[PDB]
Design a protein around this ligand. Structure first.
Ligand SMILES: Nc1[nH]c(N)c2ccccc12
Ligand code: NI
Ligand code: NI
Length: 329
């Protein structure tokens, strides 16, 4: 099942210090971790310490956990360690801007959930696993990969010296694993459509109440979608480069489907790259823009995410009209 970091790996992280200039930058929604790869594990420790406090976790167990999580992301084009840290940074920015809406247990649970939410992704969609009766689809009949990512998270926590949550009360341990489970399962975009619709209704009717656990769960669910999709909230060149990686995965999957006698959906067909700009327009109109619109209504300080998403939508529209300027691969 699960891989473990080296002694040298975690002890190195324990020693890391975040360059001073980066402290100011990491607070901003639009921050791109891309140019700082050696620092990604340290960036995560920094975020946990700012959000949750330097005493939240025993530092050794936290650095062991982080480096073993990294080792259990695969070398796939998109659903990899870079994506994990990017999603956790978006969650950090949301939490910093909305800090006292969330409990200390939720903040720690959500930062961990974001880091873990795609653990052991193989570069194949739920659609593929289920079309082709992969064993995971037999074990997990809905939200197949997401149930797997949660199981991997639990596996890593159970590794010797890796349980960062062991110091919580017996009740709080149960509560945080549930926070993490619901948060990971919520990253299944199949569930997003229903969740966003429910939230929009709750908000528009004024029945939305964050003292109501089921409402809190739904808000946290939408935060998870917003963080999972946050490549669409970066500056255009970063968004575009990330889209290249997303599609590399999709096209490798479509290649597999051709061999099994199914023509893939256009989005996963490398011979249909001309349809990508309209495909992105559809995704922004149906998924991304509604998501950030609703999130901004519920959490006003998240508005820059929506502004950036709208700017990117405008850029894809420019591509469609043939107005794009030079892009670098
Ligand atoms: N950016 C982007 N486009 C599509 N179609 C996506 C699907 C999942 C996650 C991000 C995506
Ligand atoms: Ni996922
Ligand atoms: Ni993801």
């Amino acid at each position: 099942g699960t891989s473990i970091c080296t002694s040298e790996e975690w002890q190195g992280l324990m020693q890391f210090t975040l360059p001073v200039r980066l402290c100011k930058e990491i607070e901003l929604f639009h921050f791109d971790i891309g140019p700082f790869e050696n620092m990604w594990p340290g960036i995560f420790v920094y975020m946990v310490h700012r959000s949750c406090g330097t005493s939240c976790f025993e530092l050794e167990k936290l650095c062991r956990f982080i480096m073993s999580v990294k080792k259990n992301y695969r070398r796939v084009p998109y659903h990899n360690w870079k994506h994990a840290v990017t999603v956790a940074h978006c969650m950090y920015a949301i939490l910093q801007n909305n800090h006292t809406l969330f409990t200390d247990l939720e903040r720690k649970g959500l930062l961990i959930a974001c880091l873990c939410h795609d653990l052991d992704h193989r570069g194949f969609s739920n659609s593929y696993l289920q079309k082709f009766d992969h064993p995971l689809a037999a074990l997990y009949s809905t939200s197949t990969m997401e149930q797997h990512h949660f199981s991997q998270t639990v596996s890593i926590l159970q590794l010797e010296g890796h349980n960062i949550f062991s110091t919580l009360s017996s009740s709080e341990y149960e509560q945080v694993l549930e926070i993490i489970r619901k948060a990971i399962i919520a990253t299944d975009l199949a569930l997003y459509f229903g969740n966003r619709k429910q939230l929009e209704e709750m908000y528009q009717t004024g029945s939305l109440n964050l003292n109501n656990q089921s409402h809190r769960d739904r808000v946290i669910g939408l935060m998870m979608t917003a963080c999972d999709l946050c490549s669409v909230t970066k500056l255009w060149p970063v968004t575009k480069l990330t889209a290249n990686d997303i599609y590399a995965e999709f096209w490798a999957e479509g290649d597999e489907m051709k061999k099994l006698g199914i023509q893939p959906i256009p989005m996963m067909d490398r011979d249909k790259k001309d349809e990508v700009p309209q495909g992105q327009l559809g995704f922004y109109n149906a998924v991304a823009i509604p998501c950030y619109t609703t999130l901004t209504q519920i959490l006003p300080p998240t508005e820059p995410l929506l502004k950036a998403c709208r700017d990117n939508l405008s850029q894809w529209e420019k591509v469609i009209r043939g107005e794009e300027t030079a892009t670098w691969i």
